[PDB]
Amino acid sequence: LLHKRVVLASASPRRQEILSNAGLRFEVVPSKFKEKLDKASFATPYGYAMETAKQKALEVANRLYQKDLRAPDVVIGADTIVTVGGLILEKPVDKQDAYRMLSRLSGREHSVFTGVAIVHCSSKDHQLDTRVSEFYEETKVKFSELSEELLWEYVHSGEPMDKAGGYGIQALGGMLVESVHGDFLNVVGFPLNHFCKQLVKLYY
Amino acid sequence: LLHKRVVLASASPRRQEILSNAGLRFEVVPSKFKEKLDKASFATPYGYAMETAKQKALEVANRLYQKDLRAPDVVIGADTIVTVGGLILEKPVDKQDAYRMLSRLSGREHSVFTGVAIVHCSSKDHQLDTRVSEFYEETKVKFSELSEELLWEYVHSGEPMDKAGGYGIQALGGMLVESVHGDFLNVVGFPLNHFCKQLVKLYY
Numbered sequence: 001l002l003h004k005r006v007v008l009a010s011a012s013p014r015r016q017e018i019l020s021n022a023g024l025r026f027e028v029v030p031s032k033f034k035e036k037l038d039k040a041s042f043a044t045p046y047g048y049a050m051e052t053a054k055q056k057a058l059e060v061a062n063r064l065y066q067k068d069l070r071a072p073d074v075v076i077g078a079d080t081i082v083t084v085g086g087l088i089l090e091k092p093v094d095k096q097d098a099y100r101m102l103s104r105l106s107g108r109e110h111s112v113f114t115g116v117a118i119v120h121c122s123s124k125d126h127q128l129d130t131r132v133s134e135f136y137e138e139t140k141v142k143f144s145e146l147s148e149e150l151l152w153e154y155v156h157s158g159e160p161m162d163k164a165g166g167y168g169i170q171a172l173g174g175m176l177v178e179s180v181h182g183d184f185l186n187v188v189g190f191p192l193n194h195f196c197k198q199l200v201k202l203y204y
Numbered sequence: 205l206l207h208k209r210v211v212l213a214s215a216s217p218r219r220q221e222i223l224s225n226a227g228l229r230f231e232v233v234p235s236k237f238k239e240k241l242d243k244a245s246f247a248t249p250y251g252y253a254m255e256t257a258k259q260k261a262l263e264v265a266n267r268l269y270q271k272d273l274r275a276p277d278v279v280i281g282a283d284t285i286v287t288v289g290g291l292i293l294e295k296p297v298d299k300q301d302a303y304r305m306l307s308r309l310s311g312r313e314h315s316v317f318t319g320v321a322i323v324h325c326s327s328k329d330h331q332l333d334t335r336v337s338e339f340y341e342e343t344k345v346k347f348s349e350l351s352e353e354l355l356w357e358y359v360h361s362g363e364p365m366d367k368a369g370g371y372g373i374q375a376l377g378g379m380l381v382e383s384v385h386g387d388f389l390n391v392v393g394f395p396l397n398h399f400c401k402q403l404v405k406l407y408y
């Protein structure tokens with residue numbers, strides 16, 4: 001990825017921060033794909049997460065090529081979801097979502113999945129040809145038992161709004177999260193170590 | 205505890221980061237009790253950390269009291285230690301020492317213990333009277349097998365010098381930490397979740 005044009009198809013600042021801290025230089029182009037994929041159409045939660053990441057990266061890759069006839073070398077897509085009791089939780093639409101989300105997560109152990117799509121692009125015969133490599137990472141997170149008072153003070157904090165499941169593991173969410181089991185950067189929004197292992201296999 | 209005077213008996217920036225982000229208003233008064241306790245005098249590594257956290261907070265309490273003869277209401281002390289194969293790792297003494305702790309932790313799993321002492325004070329009868337609550341938190345951490353040029357470049361960073369085991373969690377772009385099993389903020393240096401639950405048992 002040394003001399004290649006890397007595009008990250010997500011406006012999530014925590015994702016950019018993770019990849020910026022790792023040394024990766026990239027362009028930020030948020031995707032216009034809106035995640036209305038039928039969740040019931042997938043066998044596993046991480047299947048829905050990986051396919052969503054694929055579609056977000058492909059929409060960005062095609063929009064860019066259609067705009068100025070240049071194929072970006074790599075487009076990276078990602079989608080972070082939360083599963084508790086088999087149900088899929090994404091980012092809240094408001095607070096009545098965020099509160100009921102944290103209401104469901106209170107006192108249980110849930111799974112965080114991030115599906116990642118690495119899209120290699122090239123242009124051939126006036127068409128954008130794409131090679132997609134998908135992977136996911138799972139991290140188990142355990143919430144403490146949360147009173148409806150602290151549930152509400154955290155709902156209100158503005159924190160839950162653009163986080164999967166309506167919470168983070170830094171800042172105010174540390175009063176909610178009791179333990180983390182697995183890759184913690186996966187919970188923030190990006191599985192960095194798995195992402196690195198996927199690069200060396202795609203090249204060596 | 206919403207109208208009291210709170211003091212953090214530690215100079216670690218991450219420790220004040222975690223509690224400031226939680227909404228706690230407090231003063232930072234570094235303790236001048238040095239972590240010189242006899243390890244062989246304890247049965248467990250967490251007993252050592254808790255007592256070390258205890259004396260460090262008790263030193264600040266006495267120092268604040270002898271200066272003003274009015275007690276700070278609550279003094280918080282903490283001591284983070286790392287154990288790998290039974291050996292206790294604390295803050296390193298120079299760059300080659302931190303280099304050594306990283307290469308022993310490289311590629312394998314270790315334990316992170318943070319003992320915390322909450323010292324309730326009162327100065328009503330013209331004397332410092334204390335009542336201390338001790339607890340600890342354990343998190344298992346696994347490191348990647350990272351290259352050596354990278355570990356010494358992390359050592360010449362100055363980053364390992366103020367941290368137990370010679371590492372922060374953002375070490376090497378977030379690539380050093382492979383996985384986490386237990387409280388996440390415990391690895392950063394303060395078990396915030398356990399700390400808030402310890403406050404509710406002290407008051408209600």
Ligand SMILES: [Cl-]
Pocket residue numbers: 039040042043044045
């Ligand atoms: Cl499903």
Ligand SMILES: [Cl-]
Pocket residue numbers: 138139140181182
């Ligand atoms: Cl896991």
Ligand SMILES: [Cl-]
Pocket residue numbers: 144145146175176400401
């Ligand atoms: Cl709690």
Ligand SMILES: [Cl-]
Pocket residue numbers: 245246247248251252
């Ligand atoms: Cl002991």
Ligand SMILES: [Cl-]
Pocket residue numbers: 243246247248249252
């Ligand atoms: Cl011991």
